[PDB]
Amino acid sequence: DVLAKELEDVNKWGLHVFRIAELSGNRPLTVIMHTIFQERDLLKTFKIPVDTLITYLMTLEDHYHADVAYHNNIHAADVVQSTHVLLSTPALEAVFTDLEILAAIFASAIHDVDHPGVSNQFLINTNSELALMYNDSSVLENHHLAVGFKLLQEENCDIFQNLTKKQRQSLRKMVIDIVLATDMSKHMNLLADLKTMVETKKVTSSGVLLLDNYSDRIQVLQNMVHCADLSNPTKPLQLYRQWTDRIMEEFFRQGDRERERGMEISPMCDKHNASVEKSQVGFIDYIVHPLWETWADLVHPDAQDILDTLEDNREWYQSTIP
Ligand SMILES: Oc1ccc2cc(-c3ccc(OC(F)F)c(OCC4CC4)c3)oc2c1
Ligand SMILES: [Mg+2]
Ligand SMILES: [Zn+2]
């Protein structure tokens, strides 16, 4: 009842995702996904057996690393739930089909699975087997996808077993397109394209965004999930700070490995020369605010409160440097 009371916040920005993780027994991804599938009536729409959903969700959640500080199952649940809220924005009402909503939510859930807690560049610089498999190109993101789809083949895990062949083919392509777009080295090109759409966007008679081709539809979903991925500084401050604690631990541990190996330490990864507050300020100024401002423009004014929180959080971190 405690957990179930907290899951009543699932449509709200600033869900207490860390309390849900603890209240659910380190199962935040399973219970948040299950709740959202129920809320959106997805189990009935796609004839998904409830037992099949739980088995897949638990296996998926199992393949997130419980000893990685940031890129774990809690981050995955957070991104799912954030994507779920952004799908419900008034400017997008009745825009996406049930299959596109399914794809966006599923993509979010798998988008970092089996993440080892080090970056693509580190996997490239260390001659890793992952970088060798994927020829240095979206190494992690290709991997998260391969794992997320492969697990559907485990015993009683195919949650898509009752989709038509065409629905599965279309869903598979959309999920790939969405997850490869969370490759952080693609952020500038993705944002540049988003700006273009905002400059040239159209609305319908009802006031809703007009997306009449696959290219525009997938581009909005790509940016939606990328926004959810980069949504930590838009959250109430107590949530944001704990996300920063976790990312910096993960970054520090990567820099300790780059130290033990004689490599140049990556930006912000050296725990003997790291200004956490200044870096959060530059993170918001150069990455998170330019993206969220553009998204807010696309769906104006639906996202105004999310943007105000980001600007408050920016002011707060700034205020701690003088
Ligand atoms: O190659 C990649 C791929 C994915 C991610 C995700 C992030 C990321 C997420 C949250 C962050 O801060 C706070 F919001 F928790 C953050 O800031 C740390 C940086 C020094 C200023 C970075 O950084 C990444 C780098
Ligand atoms: Mg990622
Ligand atoms: Zn992520």
Topology (CATH level 3) of domain 1-322:
Catalytic domain of cyclic nucleotide phosphodiesterase 4b2b (1.10.1300)
Residues identified as active-site: 71
Question: Which ligand has the minimum distance to the alpha carbon of residue 121?
Answer: 1
- Binding site per annotation, positions for Mn(2+): 112
Instruction: Report how this structure was experimentally obtained.
Output: X-ray
Q: Is the CB of 279 under 6 A from ligand 1?
A: yes
| Of 122, 125, 118, 26, the residue nearest 71 (C-alpha) | 118
Q: What's the Cα-to-Cα distance from 311 to each of 101, 229, 230, 304, rounded to whole Å?
A: 29, 18, 14, 11
> Exposed e or buried b for every residue in 295-314, given b needs 16+ CB within 10 A?
bbbbbeebbeebbebbeebb
Domain boundaries, the chain: 1-322
207-210 contacts at long range (C-beta below 8 A, 24 or more positions apart): 207/90, 207/91, 208/90, 208/91, 208/92, 208/93, 208/94, 208/95, 209/91, 209/92, 209/95, 209/298, 209/299
Q: Give Cβ neighbours of residue 216 (< 8 Å, ≥ 6 apart).
A: 197
> What is the resolution in angstroms?
2.1
Ligand 1 atom closest to Cα of residue 247? 15
Q: What do you get for the CA distance between the two ends of the chain, in Å?
A: 45
- Binding site per annotation, positions: 71, 75, 111-112, 229, 232, 280, 283
Spacing, Cα 113 to ligand 3 middle (Å)? 9
Handedness of CA 56, 59, 65, 67 (dihedral sign): positive
> Looking at ligand 1, which residue's alpha carbon is closest to its atom 6?
230
Spacing, Cα 247 to ligand 1 middle (Å)? 6
